[PDB]
Amino acid sequence: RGSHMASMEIFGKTFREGRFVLKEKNFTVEFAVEKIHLGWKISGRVKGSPGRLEVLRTKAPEKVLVNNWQSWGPCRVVDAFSFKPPEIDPNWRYTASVVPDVLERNLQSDYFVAEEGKVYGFLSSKIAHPFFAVEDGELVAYLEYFDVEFDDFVPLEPLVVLEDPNTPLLLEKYAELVGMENNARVPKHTPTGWCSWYHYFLDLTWEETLKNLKLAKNFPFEVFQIDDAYEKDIGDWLVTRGDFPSVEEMAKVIAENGFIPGIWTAPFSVSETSDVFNEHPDWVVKENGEPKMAYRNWNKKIYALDLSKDEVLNWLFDLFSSLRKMGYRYFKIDFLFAGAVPGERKKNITPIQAFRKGIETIRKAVGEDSFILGCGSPLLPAVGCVDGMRIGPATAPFWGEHIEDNGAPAARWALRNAITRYFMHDRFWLNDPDCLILREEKTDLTQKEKELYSYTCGVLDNMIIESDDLSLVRDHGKKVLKETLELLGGRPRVQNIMSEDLRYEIVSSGTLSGNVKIVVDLNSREYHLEK
Ligand SMILES: OCC1=C[C@H](Oc2cc(F)cc(F)c2)[C@H](O)[C@@H](O)[C@H]1O
Ligand SMILES: [Mg+2]
Ligand SMILES: [Mg+2]
């Protein structure tokens, strides 16, 4: 018990243990408030038209760890009372929020929120989108059902409230419950590999690919992954451009060289210029009967597939079936937020319901022995489907000392999110902190900075992928990788998770180098490691 617990409300009514029933004009919910280890759990079921359903109300803390819904968005500590709404880029509206009306008035946090000594968190997002808002000094938890009606009962997304001095332990515990609730996939083996993006970007040639393929026999890579560059257009994934061969021919060549073939797609996205859009314009999410722009990128309007339509799911099954048959066993599936944009779909289901039919179709198509890696993705809804997940914005071959914490490529902000989302590793999935850039030339990263990034990711036990012209990686670059791989295998903890000054103390236990600690400063770019 406590004064602060007595101040809480659940579904409109002062907090206490028990079973309850709430009959309102347009919906009904039945819920239980049960005791669990380190606090409380609210669970139940709902029917009718719940709209934006208020679950919990409590006093807003002064400092809160907030979390954006998707890969690239910040997880960071923020002063709650001195919040001002950001201006929202109309090209990137839905990477900031799936409920942008909230963000333009109030501080928002998706899926969970933390303070010193306390965590509030939902265990799932299967039907509704669970978020928090700070409204006039109160913290308020909602489930958004996006105007769907339910004739029969469906389960609530469960909420837990946990209390203990050790906040790191609360987050690790929250994540364990999330893991159990969603049948998380956590492979016993972690892949190493190579990725084209962070050297060649959109200008990768097959000539350059063949060159790197040969050099990679001298590096400890299992996987060889082609990124954005090969494809004809966004949506036309089985047609290549430039000097590239067929998609089947690439897979066959990578395999012969002794590597697991990997390939990038953005599978819920189709451009205004693509073949598949012009063939099948009715396959996309709509506004007033017209195609609704999901985002703008590659200097084109990009639309979202309507994953409520059988035609669309059949098309996805056939695509990823074909890729599997060719020999691809590693799939980076990107810009997935597109699949969950609000709007008009064929069937009257939520965007989250549609997202989940989408990603389940992909897993079905590629099978169980394929490794899926999420990117640009809603986090909670993906748990149990993906094997790995990018948990930060894009890294870069420069620190970004003078770049703002929005979502623009920068090493500093990419590593920040790997630290503040550490607790998802080995519970939701394998965390992907984005690629190591270890080349000596064609870069602005200092040796110090390269050491900071790589050793931190090794301590955290995160996926280790390099992205370089392997010609430009010599003695220092090879040594940094070898040592980073030595740092894997432990159980990590960020001890000062609520810090506001970009300095962190991080421990890991049972690494291949025993027990270690690293102290890192992301502002000054300094580190201190003990083995
Ligand atoms: O377009 C390819 C691509 C896109 C994504 O990165 C960005 C996504 C953006 F919206 C803007 C940007 F400058 C970079 C992925 O995180 C990155 O890893 C790469 O695969
Ligand atoms: Mg009250
Ligand atoms: Mg591990």
Numbering used by the authors: -6 to 524
Original authors' sentences:
Of the GH mechanisms that catalyze glycosidic bond hydrolysis, most that occur with retention of stereochemistry rely on two active site aspartic acid (Asp) and/or glutamic acid (Glu) residues. These enzymes employ sequential SN2-like reactions, each involving an inversion of configuration, where the first generates a covalent glycosyl-enzyme intermediate and the second one hydrolyzes the intermediate. As a result, we hypothesized that a galacto-configured analog would covalently label a GH36 α-galactosidase, a member of GH clan-D, that has as its main structural element a (β/α)8 fold, which is the same protein fold as found for family GH13. Here we present the synthesis of three cyclohexene-based mimics of galactose including a 2-deoxy-2-fluorogalactose analog and the kinetic characterization of their reactions with an α-galactosidase from Thermotoga maritima (TmGalA).
With the aim of delineating the conformational itinerary for intermediates along the reaction path, we undertook structural studies to observe enzyme-bound species during the covalent inhibition of TmGalA by carbasugar 3a. In order to obtain a complex with intact 3a, we employed a D387A mutant of TmGalA in which the acid/base aspartic acid is mutated to alanine; this mutant displays an approximate 3100-fold reduction in its second-order rate constant (kcat/Km) relative to wild-type45 for the hydrolysis of 4-nitrophenyl α-d-galactopyranoside. We note that the active site contains electron density consistent with a Michaelis complex of an intact molecule of 3a bound. The carbasugar moiety displays a 2H3 half chair conformation with key interactions between the C6-OH with Asp221; the C4-OH with Trp257, Asp220, and Lys325; and the C3-OH with Lys325, Arg383, and Tyr191. The C2-OH and the 3,5-difluorophenyl leaving group of 3a form no interactions with TmGalA, and 3a itself has no interactions with bound water molecules. Unfortunately, after performing a variety of crystal soaking experiments with inhibitor 3a, only structures of the Michaelis complex (with an active site mutant) and product complex were obtained and no covalent adduct was observed (vide infra).
